[PDB]
Amino acid sequence: GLVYCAEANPVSFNPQVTTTGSTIDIIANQLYDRLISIDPVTAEFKSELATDWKISKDGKSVTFTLRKGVKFHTTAYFTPTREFNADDVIFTFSRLFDVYNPYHFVGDANYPYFQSVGIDQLIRKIVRVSDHQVRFELFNAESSFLANMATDFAVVLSKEYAMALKANNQENLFDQYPVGTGPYIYKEYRRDHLVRFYKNADYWKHEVALEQLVYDITPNGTTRIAKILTKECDVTAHPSSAQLSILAQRDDINVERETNLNIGYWAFNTERPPFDNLKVRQALVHAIDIEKIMQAVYYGNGLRARSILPPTSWAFEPQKNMPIFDPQLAKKLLTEAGYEKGFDMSIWAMPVSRIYNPNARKMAELMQSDLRKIGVNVNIVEYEWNTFIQRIGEHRHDSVLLGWAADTPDPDNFFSPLLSCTATFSGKNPANWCNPEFDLLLTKALDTTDLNLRKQYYDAAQSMIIEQLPLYPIAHGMRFQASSADVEGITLGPFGAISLANARK
User: Fold this and answer.
1) In a shared domain, residues 173 and 228
2) Of 301, 304, 273, 307, whose CA–CA distance to 291 is shortest?
3) Rounded CA gap, 232 and 55, in Å?
4) Which cysteine residues pair off into disulfide bonds (predicted)?
5) CA separation for the pair 273, 251 (Å, rounded)
6) I need a surface site. Which of 31, 128, 308, 358 has the fewest CB within 10 A?
7) Is there a binding annotation on residue 19?
8) Same domain, 150 and 104
9) Residue 222 is assigned to a ligand binding site
10) Where are the alpha helices (DSSP H) in 139-189?
11) Residues 224 and 361 grouped into a single domain
C-alpha cells in the first residue's frame, strides 16, 4: 500500500463541484477517467474513455466514439448492472448545464471549473448516436473545448448509480460516495483522519500496482515532512522550498521540483494615462528590484520569469529584452517621458495567496519602496476577492499585481484568456489591452495543426509582450514533491493535479 500525506479533507468526492486543489489531488486521477487526455511528451490529445473524437467542419459538433468493455466500480454500496456507455457521458456532462437534468441542482448547482471556463454555456445538447458514440452540439465553434474535456474536472460518472440514488431520494450520496471507472475504488472516509481507496481489479487501462492508497490528512506542513522522515508517509502533498532542505541528507527520500504552468505579473491599465504611454511603462519596470521580491515574497518557491511563459510551457522562448533592474535608468526615462517629475499611482494587490504570487500585499510594499526612489508614490489598493476581480474586470485600477494558473497545458491558455481583445470585453484582461496584431498571432496559431509552426507565432506573441509591456512578467511559482525513494511512477509534472494512477513500489 501507499501512504500519501494529504493537506486537507476532501470537500467532495466529485471533481465537478469544486476547484479546491487539495481535494482534486485526492480524487480525480485515482477514482476516475476522462474521455481524452493530453500526451505529456507530444502535447497531442490521447484516447482515454473515448477511442475516437471528430470535430465537424463547421466546428459546432464533436463526436466521441467510446471504449467498449469499461466497467464502473463495484463498491460496498453499488454494483453496476451494465458497462459504461453513452448515457453516462450524456448524464455526466448535461448535469453542468441542463436545468432538466435531475442532478443539476444538487446540491449547490455549482460547477466552478466549467463555469469559469464557459463549458456550461457552450454545450447546447448531447446526442446519443449509439451505445458507444456521443455527439456534443455547441452553440458556437470554440477552440478550447477539447482541452477543457481533457482537464482533471472532466471525469465520467455513473448514470446508473445516479438514477438508483434518485429513486431513493438520496441524491446527496452521489458526490459523497463515489462510483468511478478509475484505478482505485472508494473504501472509507473519516474527517480529519484519513481517506482509503483500494485497488480496482477490473480497471480497463492497466493492472493497478497497489492494493491500497491511504491519504493521511495532515494539515500542518511541518508535520507532513516529519512524516516523510519517519517513513510514516510515502509521498507528501506538496511542501515548500524550506521544509525540503532537511531532506537533502537522506538517501531514502526523493525530492522533486517542477515549475508549474503559471505566472505572476504586474499589469498596467494601458487605457489610463499615464500608463497608456509605453515609455511610462518602460520607465517604471526598470525601477523594480525583482531579486528582492524573489527573496522576500516567494522565499525560494518561485522561478524568475523570462517570458510570460514558464520554461515548462512547450511554447516557451527566453525574452532577450527583459528590462534590467536600474533605478537610475528608470528615473532618466521617466523624466524623458514627462514627469518631470513623478506622480501618484495605485497598485492593486490581489487579496489571496496563490502559487503565482504568495503575498501581493508584501510585493506591493517592496514595489512601493522601489518606486518611491524614482518619484513615484504608490497607494496600495486591496479589496476582498470577488469585488477585487470585478473592479479589475471594470478597469478601475492603475495597475494590479495578479496572476494566472493555466487551466490547460495549451500555450494559447496564457495568451487568449489574459491579453486578447475579447478578454477586454470579458473582464479578464488585467491590462485592458486590445492589440489586433497580437490577437492575429493567436488566431493564426490556433488555425494551424502543426505545433511546430505554432511556436513561431507564440514566440512572436511573447516578444510582443516584452515590447509593449501591457503587463510585466514577474515570476513562476514552483511545485515540489517529497517521497520515499521506494516509490516510483510518481514523477511531478508542470501541470495538473497530482496523480497516483501509476504509483508503484
Assistant:
1) no
2) 304
3) 49
4) 5-233, 421-434
5) 58
6) 128
7) yes
8) yes
9) no
10) 145-148, 159-167
11) no
The total of structural domains in the chain comes to 3
- Give the C-alpha separation, 267 to 231, whole Å: 45
444: closest CA among 462, 430, 461, 427? 461
Last residue of a domain, one of 149, 179, 209: 179
Classify 83 in phi/psi space as left (phi over 0), alpha (psi -120 to 50) or beta.
beta
Backbone angles phi, psi at 7, to 5 degrees: -95, -10
Crossing angle of helices 451-468/436-446, nearest 10°? 160
Residue 103 assigned to a binding site: no
E-assigned strands of 116-166? 123-130, 133-138
Q: Examine the domain organization and report whether 281 and 405 are in the same domain.
A: yes
Residue 300 annotated as binding site: no
Q: Tell me, what CATH number does 174's domain have?
A: 3.90.76.10
Query: Residue with C-alpha cell 515540489?
Result: 480
Domain that holds residue 487: 1-8+180-258+478-505
Resolution in A: 2.3
Q: What's the count of helices (H) and strands (E) in the chain, helices before strands?
A: 17, 18
Out of 129, 145, 179, a domain closes at: 179
For residue 21, say whether it is annotated as part of any ligand binding site.
Answer: yes
Same domain for 3 and 13, yes or no, is no
Radius of gyration (Cα) for the chain, nearest Å?
24
**Alpha carbon distance 205, 381 (integer Å):** 51
Method: X-ray
Whether 139 and 86 share a structural domain: yes
